[PDB]
Amino acid sequence: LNLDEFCNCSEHIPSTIAVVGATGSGVSTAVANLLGLFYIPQVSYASSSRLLSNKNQFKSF
Amino acid sequence: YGPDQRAQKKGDIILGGLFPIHFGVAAKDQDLKSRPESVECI
Amino acid sequence: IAHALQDIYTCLPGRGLFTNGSCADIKKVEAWQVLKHLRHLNFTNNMGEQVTFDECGDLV
Ligand SMILES: O=C(O)[C@@H]1Cc2c([nH]c3ccccc23)CN1
Ligand SMILES: *[C@@H]1O[C@H](CO)[C@@H](O)[C@H](O)[C@H]1NC(C)=O
Ligand SMILES: [Ca+2]
């Protein structure tokens, strides 16, 4: 919605349904911002910071 | 966004801006039964 | 992720997680539906343990 104009992307670009990552908690937070912007689930394997338990910010983590 | 929710002016060099016009966002919870929609700040 | 997709794929017509018990279509599945199914996930590991996530998405 942020752009009034219309953007174009080639159909060859696929749609990611979920993401596996990442290792660092700061990296996971930065990724989680954009991913939860679009409600894309993200499942981490090494990030263990408690700050990523807050669901008022990280909707899909 | 929308004409009522943005301040635009054309020029040679464009500067961005980010200001809080609302103190906080909606407290409505999400159950993901339907497609999530845009949230409205209150 | 695969088990959430499978739970989508085997949805009974009147037991879906969505409005009025509606189910998703696995041919045109969307990210938020997979997130919904991950929030209510419960499956068994290869070694034989149960894997669920809490209200915050944690596995202890
Ligand atoms: O949150 C974090 O950044 C750490 C990173 C991390 C953990 N365990 C590891 C093993 C190997 C390499 C990196 C890690 C625990 N979570
Ligand atoms: C998950 O499924 C197992 C069956 O293997 C059951 O015993 C357990 O109570 C279930 N847990 C939840 C939270 O539904
Ligand atoms: Ca990393």
PDB file of C-alpha atoms and ligand atoms in Angstrom:
ATOM      1  CA  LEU A   1       0.000   0.000   0.000  1.00  0.00           C
ATOM      2  CA  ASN A   2       2.954   2.339   0.640  1.00  0.00           C
ATOM      3  CA  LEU A   3       3.313   2.977  -3.109  1.00  0.00           C
ATOM      4  CA  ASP A   4       0.398   4.570  -4.944  1.00  0.00           C
ATOM      5  CA  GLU A   5       1.966   3.465  -8.234  1.00  0.00           C
ATOM      6  CA  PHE A   6       2.091  -0.119  -9.502  1.00  0.00           C
ATOM      7  CA  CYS A   7       5.288  -2.159  -9.316  1.00  0.00           C
ATOM      8  CA  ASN A   8       6.112  -4.934 -11.782  1.00  0.00           C
ATOM      9  CA  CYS A   9       7.914  -8.205 -11.056  1.00  0.00           C
ATOM     10  CA  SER A  10       8.490 -11.088 -13.452  1.00  0.00           C
ATOM     11  CA  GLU A  11       6.402 -14.203 -12.857  1.00  0.00           C
ATOM     12  CA  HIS A  12       9.625 -16.248 -12.781  1.00  0.00           C
ATOM     13  CA  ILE A  13      10.170 -14.914  -9.247  1.00  0.00           C
ATOM     14  CA  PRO A  14       8.563 -17.492  -6.921  1.00  0.00           C
ATOM     15  CA  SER A  15       6.643 -16.965  -3.689  1.00  0.00           C
ATOM     16  CA  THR A  16       8.471 -18.059  -0.542  1.00  0.00           C
ATOM     17  CA  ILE A  17       6.032 -19.699   1.848  1.00  0.00           C
ATOM     18  CA  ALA A  18       8.351 -20.080   4.854  1.00  0.00           C
ATOM     19  CA  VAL A  19      11.938 -19.318   5.841  1.00  0.00           C
ATOM     20  CA  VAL A  20      14.488 -21.382   7.775  1.00  0.00           C
ATOM     21  CA  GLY A  21      16.921 -19.033   9.498  1.00  0.00           C
ATOM     22  CA  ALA A  22      18.812 -17.600  10.997  1.00  0.00           C
ATOM     23  CA  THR A  23      21.707 -18.154  13.415  1.00  0.00           C
ATOM     24  CA  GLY A  24      22.256 -14.747  15.035  1.00  0.00           C
ATOM     25  CA  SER A  25      19.573 -13.085  17.129  1.00  0.00           C
ATOM     26  CA  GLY A  26      20.176  -9.629  15.670  1.00  0.00           C
ATOM     27  CA  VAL A  27      20.104 -11.110  12.176  1.00  0.00           C
ATOM     28  CA  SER A  28      16.922 -12.982  13.085  1.00  0.00           C
ATOM     29  CA  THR A  29      15.323  -9.778  14.396  1.00  0.00           C
ATOM     30  CA  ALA A  30      16.201  -7.839  11.243  1.00  0.00           C
ATOM     31  CA  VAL A  31      14.836 -10.621   9.028  1.00  0.00           C
ATOM     32  CA  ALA A  32      11.766 -11.071  11.236  1.00  0.00           C
ATOM     33  CA  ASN A  33      10.744  -7.435  10.859  1.00  0.00           C
ATOM     34  CA  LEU A  34      10.353  -7.719   7.075  1.00  0.00           C
ATOM     35  CA  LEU A  35       9.007 -11.275   7.189  1.00  0.00           C
ATOM     36  CA  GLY A  36       6.277 -10.475   9.710  1.00  0.00           C
ATOM     37  CA  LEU A  37       5.441  -7.402   7.661  1.00  0.00           C
ATOM     38  CA  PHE A  38       3.936  -9.893   5.180  1.00  0.00           C
ATOM     39  CA  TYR A  39       2.977 -12.689   7.630  1.00  0.00           C
ATOM     40  CA  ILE A  40       5.596 -15.072   6.210  1.00  0.00           C
ATOM     41  CA  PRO A  41       6.379 -17.739   8.843  1.00  0.00           C
ATOM     42  CA  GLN A  42      10.010 -17.941   9.948  1.00  0.00           C
ATOM     43  CA  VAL A  43      11.414 -20.913  11.871  1.00  0.00           C
ATOM     44  CA  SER A  44      14.864 -20.468  13.381  1.00  0.00           C
ATOM     45  CA  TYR A  45      17.324 -23.151  14.452  1.00  0.00           C
ATOM     46  CA  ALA A  46      19.933 -21.267  16.525  1.00  0.00           C
ATOM     47  CA  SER A  47      18.548 -17.861  17.582  1.00  0.00           C
ATOM     48  CA  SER A  48      17.790 -18.028  21.303  1.00  0.00           C
ATOM     49  CA  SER A  49      17.318 -14.427  22.460  1.00  0.00           C
ATOM     50  CA  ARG A  50      14.288 -13.880  24.682  1.00  0.00           C
ATOM     51  CA  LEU A  51      13.480 -10.653  22.816  1.00  0.00           C
ATOM     52  CA  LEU A  52      12.147 -12.802  19.959  1.00  0.00           C
ATOM     53  CA  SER A  53       9.421 -14.165  22.257  1.00  0.00           C
ATOM     54  CA  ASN A  54       7.522 -10.850  22.128  1.00  0.00           C
ATOM     55  CA  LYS A  55       4.613 -11.431  19.745  1.00  0.00           C
ATOM     56  CA  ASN A  56       3.450  -7.806  19.658  1.00  0.00           C
ATOM     57  CA  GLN A  57       6.451  -7.196  17.372  1.00  0.00           C
ATOM     58  CA  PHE A  58       7.443 -10.569  15.869  1.00  0.00           C
ATOM     59  CA  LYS A  59       4.130 -11.939  14.624  1.00  0.00           C
ATOM     60  CA  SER A  60       5.556 -14.811  12.553  1.00  0.00           C
ATOM     61  CA  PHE A  61       8.518 -16.295  14.416  1.00  0.00           C
TER      62      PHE A  61
ATOM     63  CA  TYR B   1      -1.012   4.550   1.313  1.00  0.00           C
ATOM     64  CA  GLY B   2      -3.622   7.170   0.532  1.00  0.00           C
ATOM     65  CA  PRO B   3      -3.967  10.874  -0.259  1.00  0.00           C
ATOM     66  CA  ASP B   4      -5.214  11.585   3.266  1.00  0.00           C
ATOM     67  CA  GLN B   5      -2.391   9.573   4.889  1.00  0.00           C
ATOM     68  CA  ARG B   6       0.722  11.073   3.279  1.00  0.00           C
ATOM     69  CA  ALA B   7       2.275  14.482   2.587  1.00  0.00           C
ATOM     70  CA  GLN B   8       3.657  14.857  -0.946  1.00  0.00           C
ATOM     71  CA  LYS B   9       5.386  17.651  -2.822  1.00  0.00           C
ATOM     72  CA  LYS B  10       7.354  17.370  -6.058  1.00  0.00           C
ATOM     73  CA  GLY B  11      10.819  18.850  -6.427  1.00  0.00           C
ATOM     74  CA  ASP B  12      14.267  18.422  -7.898  1.00  0.00           C
ATOM     75  CA  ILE B  13      15.641  16.665  -4.794  1.00  0.00           C
ATOM     76  CA  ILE B  14      13.327  14.566  -2.620  1.00  0.00           C
ATOM     77  CA  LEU B  15      13.628  14.244   1.161  1.00  0.00           C
ATOM     78  CA  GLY B  16      11.888  11.540   3.147  1.00  0.00           C
ATOM     79  CA  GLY B  17      10.146  11.904   6.472  1.00  0.00           C
ATOM     80  CA  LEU B  18       8.862   9.737   9.302  1.00  0.00           C
ATOM     81  CA  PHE B  19       6.742  11.242  12.069  1.00  0.00           C
ATOM     82  CA  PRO B  20       4.325   9.855  14.650  1.00  0.00           C
ATOM     83  CA  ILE B  21       0.899  11.344  13.952  1.00  0.00           C
ATOM     84  CA  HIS B  22      -0.668   8.598  16.095  1.00  0.00           C
ATOM     85  CA  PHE B  23       0.470   7.538  19.560  1.00  0.00           C
ATOM     86  CA  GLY B  24      -0.088   3.831  18.983  1.00  0.00           C
ATOM     87  CA  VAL B  25      -1.608   1.187  16.769  1.00  0.00           C
ATOM     88  CA  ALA B  26      -4.828  -0.824  17.065  1.00  0.00           C
ATOM     89  CA  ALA B  27      -5.051  -3.285  19.952  1.00  0.00           C
ATOM     90  CA  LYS B  28      -7.098  -5.752  17.887  1.00  0.00           C
ATOM     91  CA  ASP B  29      -5.713  -9.274  18.054  1.00  0.00           C
ATOM     92  CA  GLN B  30      -5.242 -11.574  15.065  1.00  0.00           C
ATOM     93  CA  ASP B  31      -6.441 -15.167  14.838  1.00  0.00           C
ATOM     94  CA  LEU B  32      -5.524 -15.621  11.140  1.00  0.00           C
ATOM     95  CA  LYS B  33      -8.910 -17.136  10.315  1.00  0.00           C
ATOM     96  CA  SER B  34      -9.175 -14.714   7.380  1.00  0.00           C
ATOM     97  CA  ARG B  35      -6.584 -12.836   5.364  1.00  0.00           C
ATOM     98  CA  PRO B  36      -4.859 -10.289   7.633  1.00  0.00           C
ATOM     99  CA  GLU B  37      -5.563  -6.680   6.700  1.00  0.00           C
ATOM    100  CA  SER B  38      -3.903  -3.328   7.314  1.00  0.00           C
ATOM    101  CA  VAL B  39      -3.881  -2.218  10.946  1.00  0.00           C
ATOM    102  CA  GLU B  40      -5.137   1.235  11.947  1.00  0.00           C
ATOM    103  CA  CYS B  41      -3.346   3.394  14.497  1.00  0.00           C
ATOM    104  CA  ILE B  42      -5.639   4.941  17.060  1.00  0.00           C
TER     105      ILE B  42
ATOM    106  CA  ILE C   1       6.938 -26.725   7.833  1.00  0.00           C
ATOM    107  CA  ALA C   2       6.220 -29.932   5.909  1.00  0.00           C
ATOM    108  CA  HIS C   3       3.851 -31.211   8.609  1.00  0.00           C
ATOM    109  CA  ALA C   4       1.954 -27.917   8.634  1.00  0.00           C
ATOM    110  CA  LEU C   5       1.574 -28.226   4.861  1.00  0.00           C
ATOM    111  CA  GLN C   6       0.414 -31.839   5.260  1.00  0.00           C
ATOM    112  CA  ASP C   7      -2.165 -30.827   7.871  1.00  0.00           C
ATOM    113  CA  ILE C   8      -3.415 -28.317   5.309  1.00  0.00           C
ATOM    114  CA  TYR C   9      -3.489 -31.052   2.660  1.00  0.00           C
ATOM    115  CA  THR C  10      -5.673 -33.397   4.753  1.00  0.00           C
ATOM    116  CA  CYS C  11      -8.243 -30.842   5.928  1.00  0.00           C
ATOM    117  CA  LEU C  12     -11.745 -32.229   6.501  1.00  0.00           C
ATOM    118  CA  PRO C  13     -14.491 -30.086   4.928  1.00  0.00           C
ATOM    119  CA  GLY C  14     -16.064 -29.046   8.233  1.00  0.00           C
ATOM    120  CA  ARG C  15     -13.039 -28.871  10.545  1.00  0.00           C
ATOM    121  CA  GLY C  16     -10.849 -26.113   9.100  1.00  0.00           C
ATOM    122  CA  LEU C  17      -9.001 -23.593  11.243  1.00  0.00           C
ATOM    123  CA  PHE C  18     -10.463 -20.683   9.265  1.00  0.00           C
ATOM    124  CA  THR C  19     -13.801 -18.863   9.219  1.00  0.00           C
ATOM    125  CA  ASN C  20     -16.850 -21.147   9.462  1.00  0.00           C
ATOM    126  CA  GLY C  21     -14.490 -24.117   9.601  1.00  0.00           C
ATOM    127  CA  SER C  22     -13.301 -23.491   6.048  1.00  0.00           C
ATOM    128  CA  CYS C  23     -10.138 -25.159   4.775  1.00  0.00           C
ATOM    129  CA  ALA C  24      -7.322 -23.862   2.604  1.00  0.00           C
ATOM    130  CA  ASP C  25      -6.380 -25.135  -0.852  1.00  0.00           C
ATOM    131  CA  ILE C  26      -2.934 -26.711  -1.054  1.00  0.00           C
ATOM    132  CA  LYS C  27      -2.684 -25.785  -4.744  1.00  0.00           C
ATOM    133  CA  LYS C  28      -2.974 -22.065  -3.880  1.00  0.00           C
ATOM    134  CA  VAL C  29      -1.832 -22.151  -0.255  1.00  0.00           C
ATOM    135  CA  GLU C  30      -0.779 -18.853   1.324  1.00  0.00           C
ATOM    136  CA  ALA C  31       1.827 -17.918   3.913  1.00  0.00           C
ATOM    137  CA  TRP C  32      -0.575 -16.796   6.647  1.00  0.00           C
ATOM    138  CA  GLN C  33      -2.465 -20.102   6.494  1.00  0.00           C
ATOM    139  CA  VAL C  34       0.801 -21.997   6.981  1.00  0.00           C
ATOM    140  CA  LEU C  35       1.572 -19.710   9.920  1.00  0.00           C
ATOM    141  CA  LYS C  36      -1.846 -20.530  11.386  1.00  0.00           C
ATOM    142  CA  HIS C  37      -1.187 -24.256  10.996  1.00  0.00           C
ATOM    143  CA  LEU C  38       2.282 -23.888  12.537  1.00  0.00           C
ATOM    144  CA  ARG C  39       0.736 -22.182  15.565  1.00  0.00           C
ATOM    145  CA  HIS C  40      -1.422 -25.296  16.114  1.00  0.00           C
ATOM    146  CA  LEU C  41       1.169 -27.918  15.133  1.00  0.00           C
ATOM    147  CA  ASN C  42       1.586 -31.263  16.893  1.00  0.00           C
ATOM    148  CA  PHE C  43       3.579 -34.087  15.283  1.00  0.00           C
ATOM    149  CA  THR C  44       5.910 -36.935  16.228  1.00  0.00           C
ATOM    150  CA  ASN C  45       9.654 -36.935  15.594  1.00  0.00           C
ATOM    151  CA  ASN C  46      11.657 -39.709  13.970  1.00  0.00           C
ATOM    152  CA  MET C  47      13.071 -40.646  17.374  1.00  0.00           C
ATOM    153  CA  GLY C  48       9.519 -40.563  18.731  1.00  0.00           C
ATOM    154  CA  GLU C  49       8.955 -37.271  20.556  1.00  0.00           C
ATOM    155  CA  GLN C  50       6.129 -34.752  20.324  1.00  0.00           C
ATOM    156  CA  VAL C  51       6.900 -31.308  18.892  1.00  0.00           C
ATOM    157  CA  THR C  52       4.623 -28.369  19.690  1.00  0.00           C
ATOM    158  CA  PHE C  53       5.183 -24.631  20.009  1.00  0.00           C
ATOM    159  CA  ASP C  54       3.873 -22.529  22.881  1.00  0.00           C
ATOM    160  CA  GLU C  55       1.912 -19.275  22.660  1.00  0.00           C
ATOM    161  CA  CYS C  56       5.224 -17.550  21.827  1.00  0.00           C
ATOM    162  CA  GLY C  57       6.588 -20.121  19.370  1.00  0.00           C
ATOM    163  CA  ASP C  58       9.161 -21.756  21.655  1.00  0.00           C
ATOM    164  CA  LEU C  59      10.295 -25.375  21.973  1.00  0.00           C
ATOM    165  CA  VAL C  60      11.732 -26.214  25.393  1.00  0.00           C
TER     166      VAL C  60
HETATM  167  O1  LIG D   1      21.133 -16.301  19.448  1.00  0.00           O
HETATM  168  C1  LIG D   1      22.311 -16.532  19.068  1.00  0.00           C
HETATM  169  O2  LIG D   1      22.969 -15.723  18.390  1.00  0.00           O
HETATM  170  C2  LIG D   1      22.983 -17.869  19.442  1.00  0.00           C
HETATM  171  C3  LIG D   1      23.897 -18.319  18.293  1.00  0.00           C
HETATM  172  C4  LIG D   1      24.262 -19.696  18.498  1.00  0.00           C
HETATM  173  C5  LIG D   1      23.707 -20.489  19.456  1.00  0.00           C
HETATM  174  N1  LIG D   1      24.274 -21.740  19.380  1.00  0.00           N
HETATM  175  C6  LIG D   1      25.210 -21.733  18.357  1.00  0.00           C
HETATM  176  C7  LIG D   1      26.045 -22.748  17.892  1.00  0.00           C
HETATM  177  C8  LIG D   1      26.884 -22.443  16.845  1.00  0.00           C
HETATM  178  C9  LIG D   1      26.904 -21.170  16.265  1.00  0.00           C
HETATM  179  C10 LIG D   1      26.082 -20.159  16.716  1.00  0.00           C
HETATM  180  C11 LIG D   1      25.224 -20.443  17.776  1.00  0.00           C
HETATM  181  C12 LIG D   1      22.651 -20.029  20.409  1.00  0.00           C
HETATM  182  N2  LIG D   1      21.926 -18.888  19.757  1.00  0.00           N
HETATM  183  C1  LIG D   2       0.012 -33.628  20.930  1.00  0.00           C
HETATM  184  O1  LIG D   2      -0.318 -34.936  20.441  1.00  0.00           O
HETATM  185  C2  LIG D   2      -0.086 -35.989  21.388  1.00  0.00           C
HETATM  186  C3  LIG D   2      -0.396 -37.287  20.680  1.00  0.00           C
HETATM  187  O2  LIG D   2       0.775 -37.868  20.124  1.00  0.00           O
HETATM  188  C4  LIG D   2      -0.946 -35.765  22.628  1.00  0.00           C
HETATM  189  O3  LIG D   2      -0.660 -36.777  23.587  1.00  0.00           O
HETATM  190  C5  LIG D   2      -0.663 -34.390  23.220  1.00  0.00           C
HETATM  191  O4  LIG D   2      -1.548 -34.136  24.305  1.00  0.00           O
HETATM  192  C6  LIG D   2      -0.839 -33.308  22.159  1.00  0.00           C
HETATM  193  N1  LIG D   2      -0.500 -32.002  22.701  1.00  0.00           N
HETATM  194  C7  LIG D   2      -1.225 -30.904  22.466  1.00  0.00           C
HETATM  195  C8  LIG D   2      -0.730 -29.641  23.106  1.00  0.00           C
HETATM  196  O5  LIG D   2      -2.235 -30.928  21.770  1.00  0.00           O
HETATM  197 CA    CA D   3      22.995 -15.993  10.147  1.00  0.00          CA
END
